């Protein structure tokens, strides 16, 4: 068999209008998947994963993470929603619909024999004017006010499934961020992924779920003689083990006499008594380590009335170090009085459904908390956990940038009239793709009325006429009823960092996918 | 479809399609589990791939061991798992409410209406049903004759009422001798042992403990009276050093001096035990029993047999907590502070062998606060009937003690709750008028199923029950013998308050979420 | 099952299993066919295995050309076949009653009751529904303006109301000039020809006949005025004897004598035709047209062309029945009694070629009693839209002439019939009280589907329609433009009496038989 002399074996080549108009249809397809998951009248979407679980959610990020596509331009839109989920909390879905619409109007100009670099240069001029328009229609927020911050987080959870328990989820998500607001040196940081642990337990009701003033772990006591109820403990956190293990050497003992073997087994007992005597000089109450505790170490802590927890995780030890104010030491003979976590409140080993849980709550000033979620099953508790992650990150953006944009369609139409009046001074070939950016922003109030069943012709004509005058300019779409209510009366306000990241990611996605005119698939790597 | 464009091997369901998937699967689990609700239900024989018989009719064991591969059937199985984890009973009635909340809502969504409007009426009906449950609960100050009638209801729905009279005296009397003075009752203090001795109707309540292992030496005493329990966690067997050392000897006579030296640290632990038997005035019988969680080498078992000390080995983790309360001693991890204060006491310690399987019994304790229900079922599947009924009955009497109020029985709660929603149905003042009607008809399946499983008419029984409730003020219910409306608070049929509270909360949220699902799809391959 | 023991390859369905098969399949045909009831319905594009487009939305063409393999769907398709066979319209509304007679009955049979109790309520409800239908019919003495509104109702529900103004003048004026003096109108006298000339909105009514074949000789006249129709059934082409004979000749001069003699019997038939043209005073134009059902050889076509006689060939079987009434002659089978009494008359006989396919037109008759609807649709699939709507409209006006009364329109019959069963619901005095309720709610799907296809609300429309009927005496109905209750007898929306009578009889018997089926099985292999 003589082989055929070819070049670039087993690959494909595609260019021309089949790739420029081919990436638009791949982006319009993902925009139709999550189109019914934007407004407050959205519905859940049950997903199936190859691990065997079930994901029933309506958030735009959790839907696209379970979709495996084969198109290369469709893989780019999934990474856009992952970028919006890591920057802000409730800024993902809105980007995929907006990037699908800015590419929808970009496909019209590609049929008009216009170069893609001309539409992108008109998109960058429109991107720089959408940022300047949102800063003019913003409003400063008093972050010290408690009731003002409850209205911001309620605007982000009205879309999600926790809108029924709005009086509870707003107080949990606000108090979780204000506890983890830590500042040691001259830098303010909010860590809601390492310190704001969301522990869910199947059982009970959702109304009994509350944010604890402290941490909790699913660990029982090491010995039943140890106390399960301490009022004011002195928690000492350890990192090393309390056992006798093999050293990091080639140690080998030559036993010649009879008394040598019994001496080694006694020196192993005396070594445990040496480190157990070093940790009781500070008179603790709770000893918590990350490694194993031998039975000889439990014997000295039993008669000293010390409650010992055995195998707490490394991520849970860093969280309890901020709640109780302790320092994680890795040496029992180098313990100091500043390494003891005083100020911890009631410690109780409760049981929730045939399983013990160590509760360290009622702290004086904790820097880390644990949201205790209780529900019907593990299916809906993963929904409230994903919704509280989108409810705590939208409170983090206000504490870092206290500016609010009128959402619910009022934000998208206030800039759509600003780009229309600014396009009259263009007088060039980039004027017509500049006008299509303002028409592409209108798809966000278009989706709020298509989900509630309102009219799309009779409402868009009246809403576009409201933004002609410069007086009110904050009229949006009421997703609950279906009429036009001003956003100063409803209370729907979105933060600036959510609206800025939505517009900056939707334009630059259209910048990337419009410069693609060729696709080569079929090559291997190392 | 859009999902078929990007991923061609990804099936999908649309808005009117995914609703018919979840509703038809909810009726599939409803029609199976409705034939075993109550005392007049039918037994189910569950055979796995190995060939073992699992004869039971509990709603949690039925949904787990069933050959079903459906996403909607897996959602109800997750809610049914948490029902049998925190409160025991209420699992079979949990699935029938979900199966009726989607069937009664199917008659309105298909007739033009939107699924979200039905969910607005479910929340307005759940708030009134939760306030009505707090008015019909009866507080009886946790009397021991009240706990008999609570345990009799949960045990009769899992056995043929001949063992229910036996297991009631084994569940109520076991839950009272654990904790007093308004203390939370730990269910880990009750051990569940499976025997095969006599018959299924011979399950007694051992006031002490029953261990599944016996003495590992033939010269030890089989029956020990007035014994001292020494609970140990030390290792009496030969253990090597952590640093690998190895012996080095020159002559053959020096080799035997090292075997005597390597057991000297082991024999020092045995000398601490045999001196404790002499320091308790050993001029009498003075039996000694060591449970000894860690294993014992046969060199130390031969040493303890010559002194008259019964020594067990390889116990459980929770045996150092149940026997510590029962004997009254101190579970020690070392022999550095041995004293007679850490010793236990039991009037009778004896063993019994059932086919090369010894069982050590510890009985005759003063205040044990830890007991053992000794199930003696003849078959393997009959052991699973009593074990699934004991843990159902123990969690039933635990909720009647922690909560101070007892909820009425079969039809005295669900019929009165549905009639309370009709008078508050024009109070919603909007489009959610039909949502309260769908929630009220879904709660009436509990008198409908119990009248159907008893062989009576379904519609003729519900007319006479609602007539006796509306023409009076008494919470009347269903009778499983005659079909006449009988009050449940007077005939001795009770239920738990937390079961009916969680049935109104777990079934409502899982119904408002399923009705708002329209994109059932399978992607990720 | 017992069928699994005898035949291991035989599937079966039990009592509660076969009921769920027939009901869920009836909902499958209901949810598909409800999107085309009325003028606001949507068009369905039906593609077969070849690739041809069948764009229609009639209920009989939808059920036949649908890739479904189900025993329940085959039962409803046979009842839907006879609805489009004897009375035309009433096929989409036929399936929606069966889809609701099994869905409203499932709410009672699954709730404890027996299926035979529901079928006893259907017969008692059919007796009141048949008596109420005779009280709402309106006799209007078959006025020609009444038949326009009857034909307009059946034609709008199959076209986009621009051709309904054209086809109503082609259906009503065709059905009037067929039979008089209380004679049953034969629908075989109307020819339906498919053309492609101008457009879909150009279908005219030819007062005579349109033949699909033209002249088979180039010397014949293409346009003939004041013609004489000679309808023949003889075979002018060369035929042999029945007995196999052959020829025998000696010389070559006797060979040509046999070819001249073998055509003597053929030319004797042609000489009877050309002598009839000379006996009708042929000193004028005096055109002659021979339709001639059997074939003609080109020897006789050349002989008739020299005299000036247009001769067609290969006509249909019913062309000797329609042209005989239109021309007024006698369809002869021989030329032994030729006379001017058997000749016809037409003022204009002309032909036209459409892509090498001639079409002979015969017009200008005195009293034809036979017409031809000339459908000139542009596409091939558009011809199937008009032909299936003409026969739907011709059978609608044929029933309105034969029956002496007209039945009102959309909601003026079904809403008033359902309200009559509520006041007669306690008249049964037994267990069949819920059977009349299931029959009354099943008749309300006709205002529910028409309010759903028009875009209005389903439950909000049925409240206002039943309010105007209970507070007045006028038979109010559904308006597909505003949603307000409007009377159907005043706006010009009528229906047939035999359609609504068979909808109460064919749907009720097929629902009482399906509900009494519990052993669906497949055996015979
Ligand atoms: N009550 C309301 N009225 C009008 N619009 C609302 C209301 N509640 C939420 N919305 C709109 O619904 C949208 C939901 O966006 P979302 O999908 O949460 O973004 P992300 O995916 O980034 O979290 C918001 O942009 C907001 O304008
Ligand atoms: N003796 C009885 N008389 C009448 N009803 C009873 C009796 N015992 C139990 N029931 C009813 O049977 C129902 C189901 O009981 P059970 O099977 O124990 O719980 P579940 O069905 O949740 O597993 C209860 O709601 C109760 O009202
Ligand atoms: N102009 C109209 N206004 C209101 N209702 C109409 C109108 N035309 C037809 N309908 C209704 O549509 C229904 C179905 O008509 P059609 O489709 O012709 O018969 P079928 O549905 O049996 O095939 C009829 O019952 C009639 O009441």
The Cα–Cα gap between C247 and A120 comes to: 93
**Which of chain A's residues have a Cβ under 8 Å away from the Cβ of B184?**
351
> Is A291 labelled as part of a ligand binding site?
no
Q: Residues with Cβ < 8 Å from A250, sequence gap 6 or more?
A: none
- Strand (E) positions, B251-306? 287-290
Cα A285 to Cα A233, A270, A322, B29, B500: the distances in Å are 5, 22, 18, 52, 41
Q: What is the DSSP string of C377-429?
A: -SSHHHHHHHHHHHHHHHHHHHHHHHSS-BEE-SSTTHHHHHHHHHHTGGGS-
Q: What are phi and psi for residue B509, nearest 5 degrees? A: -70, -35
- Domain-wise residue ranges, chain A: 1-141+403-526, 142-213+367-402, 214-366
Give distance in angstroms: CA of A92 to centre of ligand 1.
10
Separation in Å, CA of C67 to nearest CA in chain B: 19
Q: What is the bridge-based pairing of β-strands A347-351 and A340-341? A: unpaired
The Cα–Cα gap between C18 and C515 comes to: 9
**B179 and B122 within one domain:** no
Residues in contact with ligand 3 by the CB-under-6-Å rule are C 37-39, 58-59, 89-93, 153-154, 156-157, 409-410, 446, 450, 480, 493, 495
Instruction: Give the nearest chain B residue to A350 (CA atoms).
Output: B184
Residue A344 per-residue DSSP state = -
In the three-class reduction of DSSP (H, G, I as helix; E, B as strand; rest coil), residue B253 is classed as: helix
Give, using CA atoms, the residue closest to atom 14 of ligand 3.
Answer: C38
Q: Is the shortest distance between the CB of A451 and ligand 1 below 6 Å?
A: no
Give the position, in ligand 3's atom list, of the atom nearest the Cα of C153: 8
CB-CB under 8 Å, A298 with B258: no
Instruction: Give the nearest chain B residue to A267 (CA atoms).
Output: B241
**B356 and B217 within one domain:** yes
Separation in Å, CA of B247 to nearest CA in chain A: 5
Q: What is the bridge-based pairing of β-strands B358-363 and B346-353? A: antiparallel
Instruction: Name the strand (E) or helix (H) holding A162.
Output: none
**Which of chain B's residues have a Cβ under 8 Å away from the Cβ of A268?**
241-242
CB-CB under 8 Å, C113 with B459: yes
Residue A424 burial by CB count (10 A; 0-12/13-18/19+): exposed, middle or buried?
Answer: exposed
Give the number of the ligand closest to the Cα of residue B151: 2
Give, using CA atoms, the residue closest to atom 18 of ligand 1.
Answer: A90
**C363 and C383 within one domain:** no
Q: What are phi and psi for residue C340, nearest 5 degrees? A: -70, -10
Cβ atoms B83, B72 nearer than 8 A: no
Probe residue for ligand 1, chosen from A94, A445, A474 as the CB with the greatest number of ligand atoms within 8 Å: A94
Which of B387, B404, B421 is the last residue before a domain boundary?
B404
CB-CB under 8 Å, B261 with A258: yes
Q: Tell me which residue has tokens 């190995």.
A: B50
Cβ atoms B479, B485 nearer than 8 A: yes
**B106 and B48 within one domain:** yes
CB-CB under 8 Å, C107 with B458: no
The Cα–Cα gap between B477 and B409 comes to: 7
The Cα–Cα gap between C179 and C323 comes to: 15
**B174 and B257 within one domain:** no
Cα A442 to Cα A81, A128, A158, A449: the distances in Å are 20, 18, 21, 12
Residue ranges of the alpha helices (H) in B277-413? 298-307, 319-327, 380-402
Give the number of the ligand closest to the Cα of residue B93: 2
Give me C247's structure tokens: 């020829």
Residue ranges of the alpha helices (H) in A213-326? 259-279, 295-303, 314-323
Instruction: Name the strand (E) or helix (H) holding B216.
Output: none
Task: Identify the domain containing residue B175 by its residue range.
Answer: 141-207+369-404
Cβ atoms A371, A192 nearer than 8 A: no
The Cα–Cα gap between C91 and C85 comes to: 10
Q: Residues with Cβ < 8 Å from C139, sequence gap 6 or more?
A: C404, C405, C406
Crossing angle of the two packed helices B380-402 and B146-156, in degrees rounded to 10: 140
Given its phi and psi angles, is residue A483 left (phi above 0), alpha (psi -120 to 50 degrees) or beta?
A: beta
**C344 and C304 within one domain:** yes
Q: Is the shortest distance between the CB of B480 and ligand 2 below 6 Å?
A: yes
Separation in Å, CA of B457 to nearest CA in chain C: 7
CB-CB under 8 Å, C31 with B457: no
Q: What is the DSSP string of B32-48?
A: HHTTSSSTTPPPEEEE-
Residue ranges of the alpha helices (H) in C68-223? 71-86, 92-101, 103-109, 115-136, 146-156, 164-176
**Which of chain B's residues have a Cβ under 8 Å away from the Cβ of C24?**
24
Residue ranges of the alpha helices (H) in A453-518? 458-466, 487-490, 496-514
Give, using CA atoms, the residue closest to atom 23 of ligand 1.
Answer: A90
**B147 and B126 within one domain:** no
Probe residue for ligand 3, chosen from C410, C417, C491, C497 as the CB with the greatest number of ligand atoms within 8 Å: C410
Q: Is the shortest distance between the CB of A276 and ligand 1 below 6 Å?
A: no
**C411 and C361 within one domain:** no
**C213 and C352 within one domain:** yes
Q: For chain C, what is the domain count?
A: 3
Give the residue among B310, B297, B304 at the shortest CA–CA distance from B213.
Answer: B310
Instruction: Give the nearest chain B residue to A256 (CA atoms).
Output: B248
CB-nearest partner of A46 from B245, B519, B525: B519
The Cα–Cα gap between A17 and B121 comes to: 53
Name the residues of B annotated as catalytic.
Answer: 58, 91-92, 392
The Cα–Cα gap between B142 and B182 comes to: 11
Q: Residues with Cβ < 8 Å from A186, sequence gap 6 or more?
A: none
CB-CB under 8 Å, A44 with B82: no
Give me A312's structure tokens: 């707490």
CB-CB under 8 Å, B248 with A256: yes
**B505 and B410 within one domain:** yes
Resolution (A): 3.1
**C272 and C126 within one domain:** no
Give me B98's structure tokens: 């979900």
CA count, 13 A, side-chain hemisphere, A442: 20
- Write down the experimental method used for this entry: cryo-EM
Write b or e for each residue in C191-227: b if 16 or more Cβ atoms lie within 10 A of its Cβ, otherwise e. bebebbeeebeebebbbbbbbbbbbbbeebbeebeeb
Cβ atoms B488, B475 nearer than 8 A: yes
Q: Is the dihedral angle over the CA atoms C46, C48, C51, C52 positive or is it negative?
A: negative
Cβ atoms B157, B33 nearer than 8 A: no
CB-nearest partner of A224 from B184, B320, B517: B320
Note which residues in 170-199 of chain B have CB less than 8 A from chain A: 184, 186-188
A299: contact with B, CB 8 A cutoff: yes
Of C92, C119, C168, C203, catalytic: C92
Crossing angle of the two packed helices B298-307 and B264-274, in degrees rounded to 10: 30
The Cα–Cα gap between A101 and A95 comes to: 10
Q: How many CB atoms lie within 10 A of CB B183?
A: 9
Give distance in angstroms: CA of B38 to centre of ligand 2.
4
Give the residue among C207, C205, C209, C206 at the shortest CA–CA distance from C229.
Answer: C209
**C223 and C350 within one domain:** yes
Secondary structure of C222-259 as H, E, C letters: CEEEEEEEECECCCCCCCCCCCCCCCCCCCCHHHHHHH
Give me B416's structure tokens: 């009165």
Q: Tell me which residue has tokens 């140990």.
A: B232
Q: Residues with Cβ < 8 Å from C477, sequence gap 6 or more?
A: C408, C409, C410, C411, C412, C415, C447, C465, C485, C486, C487, C488, C493
Cα B490 to Cα B136, B138, B494: the distances in Å are 14, 12, 9
Mark whether C297 is an active-site residue: no
Give the position, in ligand 3's atom list, of the atom nearest the Cα of C36: 17
| Other chains touching A, judged by 3 or more CB pairs under 8 Å | B
A33: contact with B, CB 8 A cutoff: yes
Give the number of the ligand closest to the Cα of residue A502: 1
Q: Is the shortest distance between the CB of B95 and ligand 2 below 6 Å?
A: no
CB-nearest partner of A252 from B82, B245, B523: B245
Best B15, B112, B483 member to test C by mutation, with max C CBs in 10 Å, is: B112
End-to-end CA distance of chain B: 18
């Amino acid at each position: 068999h003589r082989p055929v002399l070819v070049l670039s074996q087993n690959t494909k080549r595609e260019s021309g209008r089949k790739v420029q108009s081919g990436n638009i249809n791949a982006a319009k397809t993902i925009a139709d998947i999550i189109r019914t998951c934007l407004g407050p009248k959205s519905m859940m979407k049950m997903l199936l994963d190859p691990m065997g679980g079930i994901v029933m959610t309506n958030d735009g990020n959790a839907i696209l993470r379970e979709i495996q596509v084969q198109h290369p331009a469709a893989k780019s839109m999934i990474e856009i929603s992952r970028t919006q989920d890591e920057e802000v909390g409730d800024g993902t879905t809105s980007v995929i619909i907006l990037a699908g619409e800015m590419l929808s109007v970009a496909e019209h100009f590609l049929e008009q024999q216009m170069h893609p670099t001309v539409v992108i240069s008109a998109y960058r001029k429109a991107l720089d004017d959408m940022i300047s328009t949102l800063k003019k229609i913003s409003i400063p927020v008093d972050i010290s006010d408690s009731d003002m911050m409850l209205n911001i987080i309620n605007s982000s959870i009205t879309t999600k499934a926790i809108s029924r328990w709005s009086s509870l989820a707003c107080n949990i998500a606000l108090d979780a961020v204000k506890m983890v607001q830590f500042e040691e040196n001259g830098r303010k940081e909010i860590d809601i992924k390492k310190y704001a642990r969301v522990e869910k337990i199947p059982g009970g009701i959702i109304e009994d779920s509350c944010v604890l003033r402290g941490v909790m772990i699913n660990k029982d006591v090491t010995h039943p003689r140890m106390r399960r109820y301490i009022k004011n403990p002195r928690i000492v956190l350890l990192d090393s083990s309390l056992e006798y293990k093999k050293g990091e050497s080639q140690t080998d003992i030559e036993i010649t006499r009879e008394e040598d073997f019994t001496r080694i087994l006694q020196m192993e007992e005396e070594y445990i008594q040496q480190l157990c005597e070093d940790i009781i000089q500070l008179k603790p109450d709770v000893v918590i380590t990350e490694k194993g505790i031998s039975d000889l170490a439990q014997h000295y802590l039993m008669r000293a009335n010390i409650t010992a927890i055995r195998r707490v995780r490394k991520t849970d030890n860093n969280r309890i170090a901020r709640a109780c104010g302790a320092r994680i030491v890795s040496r029992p003979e180098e313990l100091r009085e500043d390494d003891v976590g005083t100020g911890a409140g009631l410690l109780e080993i409760k049981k929730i459904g045939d399983e013990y849980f160590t509760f360290i709550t009622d702290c004086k000033d904790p820097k880390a908390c644990t949201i205790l979620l209780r529900g019907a099953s593990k299916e809906i508790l993963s929904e409230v956990e994903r919704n509280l992650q989108d409810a705590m990150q939208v409170c983090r953006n206000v504490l870092l940038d206290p500016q609010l944009v009128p959402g619910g369609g009022a934000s998208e139409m206030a800039v759509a009239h600003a780009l229309t009046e600014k396009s009259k001074a263009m007088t060039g070939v980039e004027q017509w793709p500049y006008r299509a950016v303002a028409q592409a922003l209108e798809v966000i109030p278009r989706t709020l009325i298509q989900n509630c069943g309102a009219s799309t012709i009779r409402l868009l004509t009246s809403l576009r006429a409201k933004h002609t005058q410069e007086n009110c300019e904050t009229w949006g779409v009421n997703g609950e009823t279906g009429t036009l209510v001003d956003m100063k009366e409803l209370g729907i306000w979105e933060p600036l960092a959510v609206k800025l990241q939505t517009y900056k990611t939707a334009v630059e996605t259209a910048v990337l996918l419009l410069r693609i005119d060729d696709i080569v698939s079929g090559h291997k790597k190392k | 479809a859009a999902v078929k464009t990007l991923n061609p091997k990804a099936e999908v369901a649309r808005a009117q399609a995914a609703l018919a998937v979840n509703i038809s699967a909810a009726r599939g689990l409803q029609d199976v589990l409705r034939t075993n609700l109550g005392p007049k239900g039918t037994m189910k024989m569950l055979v796995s791939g190995a060939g073992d018989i699992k004869l039971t009719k509990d709603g949690n064991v039925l949904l787990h061991e069933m050959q079903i591969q459906h996403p909607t059937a897996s959602l109800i199985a997750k809610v049914a798992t948490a029902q049998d984890d925190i409160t025991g009973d209420g699992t079979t009635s949990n699935v029938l409410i979900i199966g009726e909340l989607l069937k009664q809502a199917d008659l309105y969504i298909s007739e033009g209406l939107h699924p979200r409007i039905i969910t607005e009426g479910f929340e307005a009906a759940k708030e009134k049903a939760l306030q009505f449950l707090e008015e019909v609960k009866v507080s009886r100050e946790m009397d021991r004759e009240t706990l008999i009638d609570v345990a009799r209801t949960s045990l009769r729905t899992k056995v043929h009422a001949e063992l229910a009279d036996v297991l009631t005296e084994a569940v109520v009397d076991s839950i009272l001798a654990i904790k007093k003075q308004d203390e939370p009752i730990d269910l880990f203090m009750i051990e569940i042992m499976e025997m095969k001795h006599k018959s299924e109707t011979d399950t007694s309540l051992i006031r002490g403990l029953v261990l599944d292992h016996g003495a590992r030496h033939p010269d030890m005493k089989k029956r020990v009276e007035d014994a001292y329990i020494l609970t140990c966690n030390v290792s009496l067997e030969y253990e090597k050093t952590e640093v690998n050392s190895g012996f080095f000897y020159k002559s053959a006579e020096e080799r035997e001096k090292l075997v005597k030296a390597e057991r000297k640290f082991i024999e020092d632990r045995v000398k601490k035990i045999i001196e404790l038997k002499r320091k308790v005035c050993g001029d009498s019988d003075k039996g000694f029993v060591v449970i000894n969680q860690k294993g014992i080498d046969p060199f130390s078992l031969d040493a303890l047999s010559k002194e008259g000390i019964v020594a067990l080995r390889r116990a459980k983790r929770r045996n150092m907590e149940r026997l510590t309360l029962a004997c009254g001693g101190v579970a020690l991890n070392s022999f550095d502070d041995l004293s007679p204060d850490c010793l236990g006491h039991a009037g009778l310690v004896y063993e019994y062998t059932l086919g090369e399987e010894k069982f050590t019994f510890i009985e005759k304790c003063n205040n044990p606060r830890s007991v053992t229900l000794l199930i003696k079922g003849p078959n393997k599947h009959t052991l699973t009937q009593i074990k699934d009924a004991v843990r159902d009955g123990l969690r039933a009497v635990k909720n009647a003690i922690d909560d101070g109020c007892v909820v009425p029985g079969a039809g005295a709660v669900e019929v009165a709750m549905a009639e309370a929603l009709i008078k508050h149905k024009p109070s919603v003042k909007g489009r959610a008028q039909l949502g309260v009607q769908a929630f009220a008809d879904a709660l009436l399946i509990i008198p409908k199923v119990l009248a159907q499983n008893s062989g009576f008419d379904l519609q003729e029984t519900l007319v006479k029950i609602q007539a006796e409730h509306s023409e009076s003020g008494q919470l009347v219910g269903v009778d499983l013998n005659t079909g006449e409306p009988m009050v449940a608070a007077e005939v001795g049929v009770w239920d738990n308050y937390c079961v009916k509270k969680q049935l109104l909360h777990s079934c409502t949220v899982i119904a408002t979420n399923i009705l708002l699902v329209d994109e059932i799809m399978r992607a990720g391959m």
